[PDB]
Structure 1
Amino acid sequence: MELSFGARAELPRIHPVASKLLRLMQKKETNLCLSADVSLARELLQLADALGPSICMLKTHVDILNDFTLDVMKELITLAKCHEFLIFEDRKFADIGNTVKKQYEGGIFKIASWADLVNAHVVPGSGVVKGLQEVGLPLHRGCLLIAEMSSTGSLATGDYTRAAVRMAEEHSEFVVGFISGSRVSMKPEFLHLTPGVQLEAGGDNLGQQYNSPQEVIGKRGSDIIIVGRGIISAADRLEAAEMYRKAAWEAYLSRLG
C-alpha cells in the first residue's frame, strides 16, 4: 500500500510544506537534495540556478558562507521559486527550547525568514521542538528531526531513534519528517531525507560514510538523498546532479512497483 510522492502530497494529515515538496518532487521527477556546502555566495547562487531544475531541495549551511547577507537569501528564494525547490537550513538546533527559538528567529541569519525547513537534534527532549514551533508555526515552516546520522560512531541508534520518531509523531503540526539513513516511521506523511550518499563506496577522513542512492532509496526505503561532495567536487556539477537525480528517482520507481 505504498503511495507515490504525488498521492502522499494529498494525505489527510500531510503538513503543507511536505505537500508542496512532494508535489514538486512528482512534477520534476526529482528526489535529490543538493547539499550546497560552499563558502561563496556567488557559487551558492550559480549552483542553485544551474541545478535548480534537477533538485527538490537545496540544503544550506549559511554559517560557512564567508559573504552571507540577507540579500543573498532573497536571491536564493527567487531561484527556489523560479525552479521550484525548497530551502533547508541544516542548522541542527540542539539547545533548550528558550534558546533555539531565538537562534531560529533572530541574530544575523534570521533563519526562519527564508528557510522552508530546518532540523533539530532530539537529545534536549521535546522542548527543542516546542521552542522552534513558537517561531515556525506562525511562519508556516516545517522541521526535520535527526533520527539517525551517517557518521562513524553515531549514537543516534536504537532507543534514541525511537525517541526521535515518537517526538515527530507528537509534534506533527510542525515536524514533517526525519534526517535518517532509512525509513524510521511507518506513517507515509513523514519525509525521510538521507545524507551520506555517493555513487561510489567509501567515506571521508573525518567519519563520513557513504551509501549509494539505490541502497538508501531502494533497499532502506528513504525518500530523498542529500548529496554534497559527490556533486560539489565534480567538474560538471549539472551532469553530476543529473546522475544522482536519475539514480534516486529510478530507485524510488522500482520500490513503488
Structure 2
Amino acid sequence: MELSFGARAELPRIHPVASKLLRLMQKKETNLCLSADVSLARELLQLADALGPSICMLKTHVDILNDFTLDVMKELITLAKCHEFLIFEDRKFADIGNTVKKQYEGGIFKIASWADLVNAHVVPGSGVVKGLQEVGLPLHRGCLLIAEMSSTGSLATGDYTRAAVRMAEEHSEFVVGFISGSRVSMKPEFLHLTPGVQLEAQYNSPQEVIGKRGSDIIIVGRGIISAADRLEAAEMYRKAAWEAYLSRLG
C-alpha cells in the first residue's frame, strides 16, 4: 500500500510539518537530509545555499558552531525558505520537565524559534516528549523519536523500539516520525530518517535503506561534507535515494 510522498502529505491525520516536508520532497525529487557537521557559520550558510536545492532537510548541531548567533539562524531560515528545506536541530533531547522545555525554548540557542524539527531520546520515558511538546505544539514544530540505533553496542532493543513507536502514536500532534535504521511504524503519517548511509564501502546504500528497509529519508554527512565537490556529492546521494524511493512504488 505504498503511497507517494505527495499523497502522504494529503493524509487526514498528517502533521502540518510532515505534510510540508513530504510536499517539498515530492516537488524537488529529494529525500536527502544533509548532516551539516561544521563548526563555522560561514561554511554552514554556504553549504545550505549551494546544496539547498538538492536536499529536503538540513540537520544542524548548533552547539558546535563556534560563532553561533541568532542572526546566523535568521540567515539559515532565509535559505531554508528560498530553497525549500526544513531545519532539523539534532539536539537529541533527553531531559524532562521544565529543564527540557527551557533547553528547547530558551537559553542562548532558542532552538524552537528556528528549528522546524528536533529529535529526542525515549529512554527516560515520555517525559522528554511531554516537556518538549509544552513548547513545540504552540509553535507548530515537530519532533522525531530516536527509535533504533546501529552504532556499536547500541542498547535499543526490540522492546525499546516498540515503546518509541507507541510514544509517537500517543503524541502524534507533535511527533512526526523516527530516527531508525528501517521502517518501524506501518502508519504512513510518520516519517523515517536513517543515518549510516554510503554509496561506496557497517553503513548501507540508499537502495538498502530506502528500498529494502522502507525508510523515507537518508541522513548523510561526511560522504558529502568531506568531498571536494560537495554539490556533485549531494546529487549522487539524492539520485540514489530518489530512485530507491521510486522503485519502492512500482
Is the 8 Å Cα contact of residues 51 and 238 (structure 1) preserved in structure 2?
yes
Residue 96 of structure 1: how far off its partner (Å): 1.6
Residue 95 of structure 1: how far off its partner (Å): 1.1
Residue 39 of structure 1: how far off its partner (Å): 0.4
Residue 210 of structure 1: how far off its partner (Å): 1.3
Q: Which runs of 5+ in 1 are unaligned?
A: 202-208
Partner of 1:210, secondary structure, is coil
Q: Is 149-158 or 244-253 further displaced after alignment?
A: 149-158
Residue 71 of structure 1: how far off its partner (Å): 0.3
Give, in whole Å, the separation in 2 of the partners of 1:18 and 1:192. Answer: 11
Counterpart for residue 26 of structure 1: 26
Identity rate of aligned residues, in percent?
A: 100
Residue 68 of structure 1: how far off its partner (Å): 0.6
Give, in whole Å, the separation in 1 of the partners of 2:156 and 2:114. Answer: 28
Residue 150 of structure 1: how far off its partner (Å): 2.8
Give, in whole Å, the separation in 2 of the partners of 1:53 and 1:150. Answer: 29
Give, in whole Å, the separation in 1 of the partners of 2:152 and 2:207. Answer: 21
Q: 204, 219, 227: which one pairs with 1:211?
A: 204
Is the 8 Å Cα contact of residues 120 and 129 (structure 1) preserved in structure 2?
yes
What root-mean-square deviation, in Å, do the aligned CA atoms of Structure 1 and Structure 2 show?
A: 0.6
Counterpart for residue 220 of structure 2: 227
Give, in whole Å, the separation in 2 of the partners of 1:3 and 1:101. Answer: 35
Deviations 1:163-193 (A, max 9, x none): 0000001000000000000000000000000
Is the 8 Å Cα contact of residues 35 and 60 (structure 1) preserved in structure 2?
yes
Figure out how many residues of one structure are paired with residues of the other and give that number. 250
Deviations 1:2-39 (A, max 9, x none): 10000000000100000000000000000000000000
Residue 251 of structure 1: how far off its partner (Å): 0.2
Partner of 1:138, secondary structure, is helix
Is the 8 Å Cα contact of residues 144 and 175 (structure 1) preserved in structure 2?
yes
Residue 198 of structure 1: how far off its partner (Å): 1.1
Residue 98 of structure 1: how far off its partner (Å): 2.3
Is the 8 Å Cα contact of residues 150 and 210 (structure 1) preserved in structure 2?
no
Give, in whole Å, the separation in 1 of the partners of 2:97 and 2:59. Answer: 23
Residue 157 of structure 1: how far off its partner (Å): 2.5
Counterpart for residue 48 of structure 2: 48
Give, in whole Å, the separation in 2 of the partners of 1:223 and 1:138. Answer: 27
Counterpart for residue 249 of structure 1: 242
Q: 227, 232, 235: which one pairs with 1:239?
A: 232
Residue 146 of structure 1: how far off its partner (Å): 0.2
Residue 149 of structure 1: how far off its partner (Å): 1.5
Is the 8 Å Cα contact of residues 168 and 176 (structure 1) preserved in structure 2?
yes
Residue 152 of structure 1: how far off its partner (Å): 1.0
Give, in whole Å, the separation in 2 of the partners of 1:184 and 1:112. Answer: 26
**Runs in 1 of length 4+ with deviation above 3 angstroms?**
none
Give, in whole Å, the separation in 1 of the partners of 2:57 and 2:133. Answer: 21
Residue 211 of structure 1: how far off its partner (Å): 1.1
Give, in whole Å, the separation in 1 of the partners of 2:107 and 2:79. Answer: 24
Deviations 1:70-111 (A, max 9, x none): 000000000000000000000000112321111000100000
TM-score normalized by structure 2? 0.99
Give, in whole Å, the separation in 2 of the partners of 1:156 and 1:48. Answer: 32
Deviations 1:93-142 (A, max 9, x none): 01123211110001000000000000000011011111000000000000
Is the 8 Å Cα contact of residues 97 and 129 (structure 1) preserved in structure 2?
no
Is the 8 Å Cα contact of residues 58 and 85 (structure 1) preserved in structure 2?
yes
Deviations 1:40-90 (A, max 9, x none): 100000000000000000000011111110000000000000000000000
